[PDB]
Amino acid sequence: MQELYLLGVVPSRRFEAVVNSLSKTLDGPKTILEFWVVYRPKDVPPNLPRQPDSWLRLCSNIESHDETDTEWSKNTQWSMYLEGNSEPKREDKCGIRPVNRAKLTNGSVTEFVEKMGYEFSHEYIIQGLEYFFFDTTVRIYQTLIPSQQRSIKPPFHPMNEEQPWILHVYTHVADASNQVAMAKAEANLTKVKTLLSAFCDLKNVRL
Amino acid sequence: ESLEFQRWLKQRDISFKFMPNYPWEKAKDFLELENSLSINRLSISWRIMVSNFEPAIFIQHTPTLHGVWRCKDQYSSNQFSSLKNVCQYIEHHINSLSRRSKKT
Amino acid sequence: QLLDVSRQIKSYWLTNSLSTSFPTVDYSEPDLEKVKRTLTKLQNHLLEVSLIEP
Amino acid sequence: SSDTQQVQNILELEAKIPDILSSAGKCIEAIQLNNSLEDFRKYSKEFLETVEFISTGLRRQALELEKAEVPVVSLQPKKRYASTPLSNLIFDQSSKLI
């Protein structure tokens, strides 16, 4: 699933004012709440895929879940991601990263990645806002570090609580082989960039 | 349609029961009527009655708008196109069910 | 010309987005139940309802 | 000042300029007619103030507009559908529509 996307910081001081320029003119607001575990497959031998994407990323959406409820860890919905990296020579252009959007259904959940033996690594939580445009959507970011490993209880740990709002327009291509959704969605979201340009400056970043 | 059924049996005064269970009966807020007008399947059982000791040929009926007349007796359940099919089926009763009851 | 630029600056101060949806008339909340009577009864019109039954 | 208030400040600043022309015609009148140096000696200490102080008030209205940082581009609205007051008020009508 070839996601196409950009990046642009929004200071919190101007944030909700931007939201007024957003949500009134868009779908949402939708608060995000999803507990990550970016497990790292420490493996042998080199050359390992070793890339950040190559490390596994179980993705437990929990936005409707209680901040203290205990059934979460393997009952609330989970996911998983390796994802391809965004395209080389994708200068200023929206990054194109193919994505394996995994889903799952059992009381066992996390276990299989350790059934694959994969080690624990860094963790966080998408917690920003998202505003629809059909299949395309913008996803402004908040990624607080959780207060404890496998603990859903706030306060969490942004690198600064003067947290940047990493605004992030995107779309998700089914397959990259055709030129259609390429130029089409790039155009639509470039126009979305024209919309944000009335209040922000997004950019590509290498991935 | 249900009126056509009811008028059909007003023709002969057989006991029967329209049985609504509408979504729009419910509305905990004004936004639940928004979900109360969905095209989803809607049960409306009927209870034709002249037989005494024996239980009614209870009916399943969910006239979904798209994407709806299946009764059941002590024998077998059966989808019907027209309500007229139900009518004539209970005519197969008005003869043969009467005869089979006579043989019991 | 200064009147022109002034009117411009007026527009720039005022071209800012409204902070939210703004108040108008939300007065007198509608009945939940007359709505239900219209729905049901006008749809229940000429029908032999047998209440709810167990 | 907030919202319209800056603009309102300009609105009552509006009449503050035309009479400066009275002060200036009198600046001419000081020697053209009144024949007294003292008059324009005062109004050169007035005309420049009445003009420039307003000009500074304007340039600061603009620079502090540039601090307030109101976006210039008009957003192209999505086809908006229903704001909440519109919706529930329509519901009120629906009660009236009963």
Question: What is the spatial order of strands in the sheet that A169-173 belongs to?
Answer: A95-97, A2-5, A169-173, A136-140, A129-133
Of the candidates C21, C16, A141, the residue with the CA atom closest to the CA atom of residue D87: C21
What ranges in A41-99 are assigned the alpha helix state H?
none
d(CA A183, CA A110): 38
What DSSP line would sit under D4-32, residue for residue? Answer: THHHHHHHHHSTTTTTHHHHHHHHHHHHH
How far is Cα D36 from Cα D31, in angstroms, rounded to an integer? 6
C-alpha A44/C-alpha A54 separation (Å) is 14
Task: Write out the H or E segment, with its range, that includes residue A95.
Answer: strand A95-97
For residue A58, list its beta bridge partners.
A37
* CA–CA distances in Å: residue C32 to residues A85, B37, D85: 54, 16, 17
Sign of CA dihedral D24, D26, D31, D32: positive
Read off the tokens for B88: 């004539």
CA distance D45 to D47: 6
**Cβ atoms A153, A70 nearer than 8 A:** no
Q: Return d(Cα D58, Cα B4) in angstroms, integer.
A: 79
CB neighbour list of residue B30: distance below 8 Å, 6 or more residues apart: C30, C32, C35, D88, D91
Write the CB contacts of B14 (distance below 8 Å, at least 6 apart in sequence).
Answer: B48, B49, B50
What is the greatest pairwise CA distance in chain B?
A: 57
Kindly report the number of other CB atoms within 10 A of residue A203's CB atom: 10
Q: Find, among A78, A88, A14, the residue nearest to A51 by Cα.
A: A88
Enumerate residues 6+ apart whose C-beta is below 8 A from A107: A74, A75
Strand A2-5, strand A169-173: pairing: antiparallel
Residue of chain B nearest C39, judged by CA positions: B24
Query: A50: phi > 0 → left, psi -120 to 50 → alpha, else beta; which?
Result: left
CA pair distance D59, A184, nearest whole angstrom: 44
Question: A195 and D76 in contact by Cβ < 8 A?
Answer: yes
Question: Per-residue DSSP letters for C1-54?
Answer: -HHHHHHHHHHHHH-SPPSS-------SPPPSHHHHHHHHHHHHTT--B-----
Q: How many Å apart are CA C18 and CA D4, to the nearest integer?
A: 12
Which residue type, as a one-letter code, is found at position A111?
A: E
Token pair listed for C34: 């007359």
CB atoms within 10 A of CB A138: 27
- Dist. CA A102–CA A1, nearest whole Å: 11
CA quadruple C38, C41, C44, C50: dihedral, nearest 10? 140
CA distance B30 to A97: 43
CA atoms within 13 A on the CB side of D58: 22
Substitution target from D2, D69, D73 for chain A, most A beta carbons within 10 A: D73
Half-sphere exposure of A27 (CA within 13 A, CB side): 10
- Subunit contact D75:C23, Cβ cutoff 8 A: no
Looking at residue A139, its amino acid is R
Residue A93 to residue C28: CA distance in whole angstroms: 52
> CA A34 to CA A59: how far, in whole Å?
7
Q: Which candidate, B1, B91, B96, B102, places its Cα nearest to that of B46?
A: B1
Phi/psi of residue C13, each to 5°? Answer: -65, -35
A91: left (phi over 0), alpha (psi -120 to 50) or beta: beta
Domain region containing A177:
1-207
Degrees, nearest 5: CA angle B44-B50-B53: 100
CA distances from residue A195 to A188, A190, C1, C49 in whole angstroms, order as listed:
10, 9, 31, 56
* Residues contacting A43, CB < 8 A, separation 6+: none
CATH label of the domain that carries residue A42 = 2.40.320.10
* Contact flag for B and A (3+ C-beta pairs < 8 Å): no
What whole-number distance in Å separates Cα of residue D88 and Cα of residue C28? 10
Structure tokens at D23: 């002060």
Q: Cα–Cα distance between D11 and B49 in angstroms, integer?
A: 84
The Cα B46–Cα B90 span in angstroms is: 12
Q: How many domains does chain A have?
A: 1
Helix D84-96 / helix C33-44 crossing angle, nearest 10 deg: 60
Residues in chain A with CB shorter than 8 Å from the CB of D77 are 25
Type of residue found at A201: D
Residues in chain A: 207
Measured in degrees and rounded to the nearest 5, phi and psi for residue A29 equal: -65, 145
**Contact (Cβ atoms closer than 8 angstroms) between residue A95 and residue A207:** yes
Q: Fill in the amino acid letter for A43.
A: D
D20: Cβ contacts below 8 Å, ≥ 6 apart: D47, D50, D51, D54
Alpha-carbon gap, residue A164 to A195, rounded angstroms: 20
Strand partners for A8: A167
C residues 11-30 closer than 8 Å to B (CB): 30
The answer to whether A147 and A154 have CB atoms below 8 angstroms apart is: yes
Q: Which residues contact A128 (CB under 8 A, 6 or more apart)?
A: A32, A139, A140, A141, A142, A143, A165, A166, A168
The count of other CB atoms within 10 Å of the CB of residue D12 is 8
Measure CB to CB from residue C9 to each of D4, D62, D74 and give the nearest one: D62
- Could you identify the residue written with the tokens 């024998």? B75
Chain C positions touching B18 (Cβ under 8 A) are: 47-50
Q: What three-state secondary structure class fits A191?
A: helix
Q: Which among D61, D72, D85 is the nearest to C26, CB-wise?
A: D85
Please give the Cα distance from B90 to B22 (Å, whole number).
27
Alpha-carbon gap: D9 to the closest alpha carbon of chain A (Å): 24
Q: Which residues contact A65 (CB under 8 A, 6 or more apart)?
A: A33, A72, A76, A152
* CA-to-CA separations, A143 to A37, A97, A146, C5, in angstroms, rounded: 12, 20, 9, 44
Q: What is the DSSP letter of D19?
A: T
Q: Which residue has the tokens 């004539």?
A: B88
- Residues C26, D85: Cα–Cα separation, whole Å: 6
- Contact between residue A146 and residue A124 where contact means Cβ atoms under 8 Å apart: yes
The phi and psi torsions of A8 (rounded to 5 degrees) equal: -160, 120
Q: Cα separation of D78 and A82, whole Å?
A: 35
Residue A105: both structure tokens together = 């259904």
Q: How was it solved?
A: cryo-EM
Contacts of D90 (CB under 8 A, 6+ apart): D82
Contact, A32 vs A127, CB < 8 A? Answer: yes
